Enzyme design. Structure first.
Site, PDB file in Angstrom:
ATOM      1  N   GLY A 179      38.919  40.270  39.679  1.00  0.00           N
ATOM      2  CA  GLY A 179      39.341  38.869  39.051  1.00  0.00           C
ATOM      3  C   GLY A 179      38.494  37.580  38.529  1.00  0.00           C
ATOM      4  O   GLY A 179      36.531  38.591  37.802  1.00  0.00           O
ATOM      5  N   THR A 216      43.557  36.175  43.095  1.00  0.00           N
ATOM      6  CA  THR A 216      42.657  37.596  43.010  1.00  0.00           C
ATOM      7  C   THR A 216      41.773  38.232  43.595  1.00  0.00           C
ATOM      8  O   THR A 216      41.984  39.222  44.440  1.00  0.00           O
ATOM      9  CB  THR A 216      42.450  37.676  40.858  1.00  0.00           C
ATOM     10  N   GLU A 276      19.244  53.501  53.134  1.00  0.00           N
ATOM     11  CA  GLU A 276      18.557  53.814  54.497  1.00  0.00           C
ATOM     12  C   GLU A 276      18.423  52.567  55.400  1.00  0.00           C
ATOM     13  O   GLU A 276      18.041  52.728  55.791  1.00  0.00           O
ATOM     14  CB  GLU A 276      17.454  54.537  54.143  1.00  0.00           C
ATOM     15  N   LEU A 308      19.254  51.903  49.239  1.00  0.00           N
ATOM     16  CA  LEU A 308      19.888  51.267  49.539  1.00  0.00           C
ATOM     17  C   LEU A 308      20.711  51.496  51.052  1.00  0.00           C
ATOM     18  O   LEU A 308      20.578  50.954  52.538  1.00  0.00           O
ATOM     19  CB  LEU A 308      21.689  50.920  48.351  1.00  0.00           C
ATOM     20  N   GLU A 316      45.430  37.712  35.310  1.00  0.00           N
ATOM     21  CA  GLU A 316      45.884  38.052  33.572  1.00  0.00           C
ATOM     22  C   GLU A 316      44.539  38.459  32.427  1.00  0.00           C
ATOM     23  O   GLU A 316      43.284  38.600  33.597  1.00  0.00           O
ATOM     24  CB  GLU A 316      45.176  36.195  33.748  1.00  0.00           C
TER      25      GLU A 316
HETATM   26  N1  LIG Z   1      29.418  32.231  40.941  1.00  0.00           N
HETATM   27  C1  LIG Z   1      30.678  32.931  39.627  1.00  0.00           C
HETATM   28  N2  LIG Z   1      31.297  32.224  40.192  1.00  0.00           N
HETATM   29  C2  LIG Z   1      32.564  32.216  40.131  1.00  0.00           C
HETATM   30  C3  LIG Z   1      32.175  32.678  38.731  1.00  0.00           C
HETATM   31  N3  LIG Z   1      34.435  32.105  38.104  1.00  0.00           N
HETATM   32  C4  LIG Z   1      34.767  32.390  39.445  1.00  0.00           C
HETATM   33  N4  LIG Z   1      33.930  31.642  39.831  1.00  0.00           N
HETATM   34  C5  LIG Z   1      34.368  31.244  42.152  1.00  0.00           C
HETATM   35  O1  LIG Z   1      35.710  31.854  42.032  1.00  0.00           O
HETATM   36  C6  LIG Z   1      36.638  31.150  42.682  1.00  0.00           C
HETATM   37  C7  LIG Z   1      37.822  30.808  41.942  1.00  0.00           C
HETATM   38  O2  LIG Z   1      38.470  31.804  41.573  1.00  0.00           O
HETATM   39  P1  LIG Z   1      38.653  33.080  40.770  1.00  0.00           P
HETATM   40  O3  LIG Z   1      37.447  34.189  40.890  1.00  0.00           O
HETATM   41  O4  LIG Z   1      38.368  31.844  39.479  1.00  0.00           O
HETATM   42  O5  LIG Z   1      39.647  33.710  40.970  1.00  0.00           O
HETATM   43  P2  LIG Z   1      40.920  34.936  40.743  1.00  0.00           P
HETATM   44  O6  LIG Z   1      40.040  36.082  41.433  1.00  0.00           O
HETATM   45  O7  LIG Z   1      40.732  35.194  39.182  1.00  0.00           O
HETATM   46  O8  LIG Z   1      42.249  34.352  41.002  1.00  0.00           O
HETATM   47  P3  LIG Z   1      43.605  34.041  40.419  1.00  0.00           P
HETATM   48  O9  LIG Z   1      43.612  33.422  39.337  1.00  0.00           O
HETATM   49  O10 LIG Z   1      43.657  32.574  41.053  1.00  0.00           O
HETATM   50  O11 LIG Z   1      44.784  34.563  39.870  1.00  0.00           O
HETATM   51  C8  LIG Z   1      35.561  29.385  42.432  1.00  0.00           C
HETATM   52  O12 LIG Z   1      34.740  29.380  43.997  1.00  0.00           O
HETATM   53  C9  LIG Z   1      35.544  28.977  41.377  1.00  0.00           C
HETATM   54  O13 LIG Z   1      33.294  28.587  41.359  1.00  0.00           O
HETATM   55  C10 LIG Z   1      31.970  33.004  38.082  1.00  0.00           C
HETATM   56  O14 LIG Z   1      31.480  33.398  37.068  1.00  0.00           O
HETATM   57  N5  LIG Z   1      30.514  33.176  38.856  1.00  0.00           N
HETATM   58 MG   LIG Z   2      41.834  34.450  37.800  1.00  0.00          MG
END
Ligand SMILES: Nc1nc2c(ncn2[C@@H]2O[C@H](COP(=O)(O)OP(=O)(O)OP(=O)(O)O)[C@@H](O)[C@H]2O)c(=O)[nH]1
Ligand SMILES: [Mg+2]
Ligand SMILES: Nc1nc2c(ncn2[C@@H]2O[C@H](COP(=O)(O)OP(=O)(O)O)[C@@H](O)[C@H]2O)c(=O)[nH]1
Ligand SMILES: Cc1cccc(C(=O)N2CCC(C(N)=O)CC2)c1
Ligand SMILES: Cc1cccc(C(=O)N2CCC(C(N)=O)CC2)c1
Ligand SMILES: [Ca+2]
Ligand SMILES: [Ca+2]
Ligand SMILES: [Mg+2]
Lengths: 69, 431, 440
Positions: C10, C145, C254, C252, C71
Site C-alpha cells: 500500500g 490495501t 536475540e 535483532l 493502484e
Molecule cells: N507515515 C506515513 N503514513 C502514511 C503514508 N501514506 C499513507 N499513510 C497513512 O496510511 C493511512 C491510509 O492508508 P494508505 O497506505 O494510504 O492506503 P492503501 O494501503 O494504499 O490502501 P487503499 O488506497 O485503500 O487501497 C492513513 O492513516 C495515512 O495517514 C506515508 O507515506 N507515511
Molecule cells: Mg492506496
C-alpha cells in the site's frame, strides 16, 4: 531418552504442519464464504432492477389497454 | 487511469453540463478545439479522468448528451465549447417530454434509452479502469427527471459494481411555475434513494436566494443560477481531477461520506460568494473563508445545518494558503460547533487542499455536507406533493401513460421514510 | 545466509519503503544504479549487508524487496524515480483499482486477483536465499490495501513458509494525516486477522511522529516525506544489527527473545534519540548519557502512551555510532536512580544492550541533524495497550450504529467478522492487563 528425543521433534513437525493446515482451511472457508456473500448481494440488486423492468413493461402494456378503449 | 463517464439529460442537465465542461476545460488548459495550452503539468496529470486523448493530441470530454428534443443540445453544439464534444455522443429524440416524468421514464424516454446505452457502452469499453458515472439533470422536468433516472437503473444493470453519482437540480416555485414539478421531483427522489451512490442536491431555491439576497440580482436568470452550479461542480470534483490524497476517486469519497446506503444526498457549499458591487477591502483570510463555507447562506441547498447534525463532511480548499492555518481553522470550527457533528462518527470531517485556484479567485473553499438538516429540502417537496396528490390534481398526465396512483403513494412513502431516517440518526446518541 | 525479505504494501508501506531503501543505500555506499565500489566480491558474497541486498554478476546490489499496491500511482513514482534502476521491474507490482479504504476489498474483492502473482514474486526472492530468516512487512493499519491485503498476504505466507518469522512495521492512524473515517474498522480487522501470523510488530503512531517533527524539528505542517524520513531512521536503527557486523553487535532476533514473553504480547514500544535540527545540533554534541535519558522521555516514543502507568517486561537499548559500554553503563546507572522503571515481578530487570559502530547517516535535503551517535530503545510495556484502547473506542462508537458497515457487507463480509475481531481485541487488552498483575 532417544525415544523421547524422537517424540519431541515429531511433535514440533506435527504442530507446524497442523498450523499450516488450519490456516489453509480457514482461508479457504473465508474466501468461499465471501465469494458467495458478494455474489448474493449483486444477485439481489440485479433482481430488483429486473422487477423494475417488468413493472415498466406492465406500465406500457397498461397504456395500450386504455388507448384501445 | 480511473475514467469517469459523464451524462447530461434534458434542458437543465445539458445547460449545467455544458457550463461544467467549459469551466473545467479552462482549469485544465483545454481550448474549445480540444488542444492543450496550459502552463502546469498538474493540469494533465489526471486529465484522463474526464477526457479522452485522440489523434493530434486532442482531448475529447468523455461526455454523452441526451434529450428528447433537439433545442437545448442544438444550442450547446453552437455554444463556446460546442465543437469539443464528440458529435456521435449527441443522442436526442423529437417528441420531447412535456415536463412529464412518465413520458421520460416509461414512454418517450424508454424508446430512446437503448440508443443512449449504445453510446455509454462505447465510452466504457475504451476505459482503462472505469470508476463510474456522473449525471447532471433536473428533477422537476420530464427528460432529466424521468429519463435520467431510467438511464441510472439501466446503467446500474450493466455496471452494478461501479459508482453512480448525480448532480440533481431540485425544483422551487421561486424559479419555475410549472405546477407538476413536485410530482416529477418526488418520483425521481424515489429512484435516487435506491439507485445512486451519491447525489449532490443542487437546490434552485438556494441558488435563487443566493443570487437575489447575496449577489443582489433583482432578476436572476438561469445563466446566473448556472454560474453557482458550475462553480460548485468544479469545486466538488477538484479532488477527482488533480493530484490528491483525500477523496481522490468516487468510491473513496462514498466510503467517507455515506455511513448508511440511503443517506447519500449531499448539501454542497461554496465560498466566497460576493456581489460584483461589493468592494473587497482586504483579501479573504483562512478563518473568514472557513467560517463562510460553513454558513447556511453559502449552501446550495435551502437547508440550515444548525437545524440538524453532520454525519460526515468533506472540505476542499483551493489556492495558495497556509496549510497549518487551514488545519487550525478546521479544528476550530469543529470544536466550536461540536454540538452539530454526531459524536458516534469520530473524525468525520476530512480536508483536501489543491494548489490550483478556480478562475478569477485567489482562494476558494468548497463544502460537501451529509447533514440530517437535508430533511428540510425533502419536507418542502413532500408538502408541495401532498398538497396536489390529496386532491389527485393533474394525475391524468401520468395515469394516461400507464401509471397508477399506487406508484405515487409508494414514492411518497419512500421519501417520507427518508426524512424519518435522517431524524432517527439526528436524535441518536453515543450513550 | 540469514537473508531478510522486505514487503511493502500500500501507499504508506511503499513510501516508507522508498525512504528506507534510499537510507540503506547511503549507509552502505550503494549508488542509485546499484553499484557498490567498496564491495570487492562481484556477483555474490556473505557480508552482513547481503542480508538485505542480493548481487548480480554485473555488480548490481538489488534490494531483497517486493513493492505491492492495488493502484499504480505510488509505485509508478518508484518506477520513474531516482532509484528506478535499483529494482528489477518484477519487484514492483501494481493493480489498476485500489481497495477504496475498505479492508474487504483489500483482503477479498480486489486483493484476491493479485495475491497469487505477489506470492510468485516473493518465491523468486526466496529461491535466491541460502538461509532465509524471514520477512519484514511494512503497511498502514488504515488503508484498504495496508489492512486487508496485508492480512491476506500474512495468512498466505504462513501457509507457504510455515512458522518462518514475519515482523511488521505498522502505521497506526492519526487524525492529522488520516484519509478515511473507517480507519478504526480497518485497523481492528487487520490486527485481529494478522495477530496469530506475526511474530513481532513495531507500531508507528503517525500522531507521535507528527508531534516529534513539529516539536523537535520545527516543522510547522509535517508531510509524509517529513514523517517517513524519521520513520526510516528508526527502521534503520532496528535493522542495523542485521546489516552491519560488529564485536558489540547484538542480533535483532536475540532482542526478540527478551521482547516476546507470550505469542500475543509481541508489540514493542520504540523510542528514538536524538531528533534534533541542524541549527540546534550545531556546536551541541549530544553524549551517550543525553540520548539515553531521552529514550525515557514519553515525548520521544513512536506510539503515544504513558509507560509510567504500566509495567515493563523488557528494556533493550540499540546504540549506533560512537558509543562504548562504559558510557552506556554509566548512563544506565543514572537512569536507574532517577526514573522508577517498574518491571512485572516475573521478569528480570536488566537492560539488554547492543552497539553497532557504524555511525548514523542522513539523506541530503532532510530535517535531522547529522549525529555521531544515536539509540533506539525497544521496550515491552503493558502501556502500549493504550493504543488499542483508543482504536477500540472509535470502533465501538461507529459499530454501535453500524455506520459504514454496509460497505464491508456489500463486498462479502459479515457482521460476525466485526464482532469476532473486536472480541479478540478485547481479549488482547485483557491479556495486557493480566501480564502486568503481580504473581500470587
Ligand atoms: N507515515 C506515513 N503514513 C502514511 C503514508 N501514506 C499513507 N499513510 C497513512 O496510511 C493511512 C491510509 O492508508 P494508505 O497506505 O494510504 O492506503 P492503501 O494501503 O494504499 O490502501 P487503499 O488506497 O485503500 O487501497 C492513513 O492513516 C495515512 O495517514 C506515508 O507515506 N507515511
Ligand atoms: Mg492506496
Ligand atoms: N439551475 C438551472 N435550473 C434549470 C435550468 N433549466 C431548467 N431548470 C429547472 O429544471 C426544471 C425544469 O426541468 P427541465 O430540465 O426543463 O425538463 P426536461 O428538459 O424535460 O428534463 C425547472 O424546475 C427549472 O427551474 C438551468 O439551466 N439551470
Ligand atoms: C497461543 C498462545 C499460547 C500461550 C500464550 C499465549 C498468549 O499470548 N497469552 C497472552 C498472555 C496471557 C497471560 N499470561 O495472562 C496468556 C495467553 C498464546
Ligand atoms: C558486566 C559484564 C561483564 C562481562 C561481560 C559483559 C558483556 O559484555 N555482556 C554483553 C551485554 C549484556 C547486556 N546486559 O546487554 C551483559 C553481558 C558484561
Ligand atoms: Ca559482494
Ligand atoms: Ca487472557
Ligand atoms: Mg424546460
Amino acid at each position: 531418552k532417544r525415544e523421547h528425543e524422537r517424540e519431541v521433534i515429531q511433535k514440533a513437525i506435527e504442530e507446524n504442519n497442523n498450523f499450516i493446515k488450519m490456516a489453509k482451511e480457514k482461508l479457504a472457508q473465508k474466501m468461499e464464504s465471501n465469494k458467495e456473500n458478494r455474489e448474493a448481494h449483486l444477485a439481489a440488486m440485479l433482481e430488483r432492477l429486473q422487477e423494475k423492468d417488468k413493472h415498466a413493461e406492465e406500465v406500457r402494456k397498461n397504456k395500450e389497454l386504455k388507448e384501445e378503449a | 487511469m480511473r475514467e469517469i463517464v459523464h451524462i447530461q439529460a434534458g434542458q437543465c442537465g445539458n445547460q449545467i453540463g455544458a457550463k461544467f465542461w467549459e469551466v473545467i476545460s479552462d482549469e485544465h488548459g483545454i481550448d474549445p478545439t480540444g488542444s492543450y495550452h496550459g502552463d502546469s503539468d498538474l493540469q494533465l496529470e489526471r486529465i484522463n479522468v474526464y477526457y479522452n486523448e485522440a489523434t493530434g493530441n486532442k482531448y475529447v470530454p468523455r461526455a454523452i448528451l441526451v434529450d428528447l428534443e433537439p433545442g437545448t443540445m442544438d444550442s450547446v453544439r453552437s455554444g463556446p465549447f460546442g465543437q469539443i464534444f464528440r458529435p456521435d455522443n449527441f443522442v436526442f429524440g423529437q417528441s420531447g417530454a412535456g415536463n412529464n416524468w412518465a413520458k421520460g421514464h416509461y414512454t418517450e424516454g424508454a424508446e430512446l434509452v437503448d440508443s443512449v446505452l449504445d453510446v455509454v457502452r462505447k465510452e466504457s469499453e475504451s476505459c482503462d479502469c472505469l470508476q463510474g458515472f456522473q449525471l447532471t439533470h433536473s428533477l422537476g422536468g420530464g427528460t432529466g427527471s424521468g429519463m435520467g433516472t431510467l438511464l441510472i437503473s439501466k446503467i446500474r444493470e450493466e455496471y452494478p459494481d461501479r459508482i453512480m453519482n448525480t448532480f440533481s437540480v431540485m425544483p422551487s416555485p421561486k424559479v419555475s411555475d410549472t405546477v407538476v414539478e413536485p410530482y416529477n421531483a418526488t418520483l425521481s427522489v424515489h429512484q435516487l434513494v435506491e439507485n445512486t451512490d451519491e447525489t449532490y442536491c443542487i437546490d434552485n431555491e438556494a441558488l435563487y436566494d443566493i443570487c437575489f439576497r447575496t449577489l443582489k440580482l433583482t432578476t436572476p436568470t438561469y445563466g446566473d443560477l448556472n454560474h453557482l452550479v458550475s462553480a460548485t461542480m468544479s469545486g466538488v470534483t477538484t479532488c477527482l481531477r488533480f493530484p490528491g490524497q483525500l477523496n481522490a476517486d468516487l468510491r473513496k469519497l462514498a466510503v467517507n461520506m455515506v455511513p448508511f446506503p440511503r443517506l447519500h444526498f449531499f448539501m454542497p457549499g461554496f465560498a466566497p460568494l460576493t456581489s460584483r458591487g461589493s468592494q473587497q477591502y482586504r483579501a479573504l483570510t483562512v478563518p473568514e473563508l472557513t467560517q463562510q463555507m460553513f454558513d447556511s447562506k453559502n449552501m446550495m441547498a435551502a437547508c440550515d445545518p444548525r437545524h440538524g447534525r453532520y454525519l460526515t463532511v468533506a472540505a476542499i480548499f483551493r489556492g495558495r494558503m497556509s496549510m497549518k492555518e487551514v488545519d487550525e481553522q478546521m479544528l476550530n470550527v469543529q470544536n466550536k460547533n461540536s454540538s452539530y457533528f454526531v459524536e458516534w462518527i469520530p473524525n468525520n470531517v476530512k480536508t483536501a487542499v489543491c494548489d490550483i485556484p478556480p478562475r478569477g479567485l485567489k482562494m476558494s473553499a468548497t463544502f460537501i455536507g451529509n447533514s440530517t438538516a437535508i430533511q428540510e429540502l425533502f419536507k418542502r417537496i413532500s408538502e408541495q406533493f401532498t398538497a396536489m396528490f390529496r386532491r389527485k390534481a393533474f394525475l391524468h398526465w401520468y395515469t394516461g401513460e400507464g401509471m397508477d396512483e399506487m406508484e405515487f403513494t409508494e414514492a411518497e412513502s419512500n421519501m417520507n421514510d427518508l426524512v424519518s431516517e435522517y431524524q432517527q440518526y439526528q436524535d441518536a446518541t453515543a450513550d | 545466509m540469514r537473508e531478510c525479505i522486505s514487503i511493502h504494501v500500500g501507499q504508506a508501506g511503499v513510501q516508507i519503503g522508498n525512504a528506507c531503501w534510499e537510507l540503506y543505500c547511503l549507509e552502505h555506499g550503494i549508488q542509485p544504479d546499484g553499484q557498490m565500489p567498496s564491495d570487492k566480491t562481484i556477483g555474490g558474497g556473505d557480508d552482513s549487508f547481503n542480508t538485505f541486498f542480493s548481487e548480480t554478476g554485473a555488480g548490481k546490489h538489488v534490494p531483497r524487496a517486493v513493492f505491492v499496491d492495488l493502484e499504480p500511482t505510488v509505485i509508478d513514482e518508484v518506477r520513474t524515480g531516482t532509484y528506478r534502476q535499483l529494482f528489477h521491474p518484477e519487484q514492483l507490482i501494481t493493480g489498476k483499482e485500489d481497495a477504496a479504504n475498505n479492508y474487504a476489498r483489500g483482503h477479498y474483492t480486489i486483493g484476491k486477483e493479485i495475491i497469487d502473482l505477489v506470492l510468485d514474486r516473493i518465491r523468486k526472492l526466496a529461491d535466491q536465499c541460502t538461509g532465509l530468516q524471514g520477512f519484514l512487512v511494512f503497511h498502514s493499519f488504515g488503508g484498504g490495501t495496508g489492512s486487508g491485503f496485508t492480512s491476506l498476504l500474512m495468512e498466505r505466507l504462513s501457509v507457504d513458509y510455515g512458522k518462518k518469522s514475519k515482523l511488521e512495521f505498522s502505521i497506526y492512524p492519526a487524525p492529522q494525516v488520516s484519509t478515511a473515517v473507517v480507519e478504526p474498522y480497518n485497523s481492528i480487522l487487520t490486527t485481529h486477522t494478522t495477530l496469530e501470523h506475526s511474530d513481532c510488530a513495531f507500531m508507528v503512531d503517525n500522531e507521535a511522529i507528527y508531534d516529534i517533527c513539529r516539536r523537535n524539528l520545527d516543522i510547522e505542517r509535517p508531510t509524509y516525506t517529513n514523517l517517513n524520513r524519521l520513520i526510516s531512521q528508526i527502521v534503520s536503527s532496528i535493522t542495523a544489527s542485521l546489516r552491519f557486523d560488529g564485536a558489540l553487535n547484538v542480533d535483532l532476533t536475540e532482542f526478540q527473545t527478551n521482547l516476546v514473553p507470550y505469542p500475543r504480547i509481541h508489540f514493542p514500544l520504540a523510542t528514538y534519540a536524538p531528533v534534533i535540527s541542524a541549527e540546534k545540533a550545531y556546536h551541541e554534541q549530544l553524549s551517550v548519557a543525553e540520548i539515553t535519558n531521552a529514550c525515557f522521555e514519553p515525548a520521544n516514543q513512536m506510539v503515544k502512551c504513558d509507560p509510567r502507568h504500566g509495567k515493563y517486561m523488557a528494556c533493550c537499548l540499540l546504540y549506533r555510532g560512537d558509543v562504548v559500554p562504559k558510557d552506556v553503563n554509566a548512563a544506565i546507572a543514572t537512569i536507574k536512580t532517577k526514573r522508577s522503571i517498574q518491571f512485572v515481578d516475573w521478569c528480570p530487570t536488566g537492560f539488554k544492550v547492543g552497539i553497532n559502530y557504524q555511525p548514523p547517516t542522513v539523506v541530503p535535503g532532510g530535517d535531522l541533524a547529522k549525529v555521531q551517535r544515536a539509540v533506539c530503545m525497544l521496550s515491552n510495556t503493558t502501556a502500549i495497550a493504550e493504543a488499542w484502547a483508543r482504536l477500540d473506542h472509535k470502533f465501538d462508537l461507529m459499530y454501535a450504529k453500524r455506520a459504514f458497515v454496509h460497505w464491508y457487507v456489500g463486498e462479502g463480509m459479515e457482521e460476525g467478522e466485526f464482532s469476532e475481531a473486536r472480541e479478540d481485541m478485547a481479549a488482547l487488552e485483557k491479556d495486557y492487563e493480566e501480564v502486568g498483575v503481580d504473581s500470587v
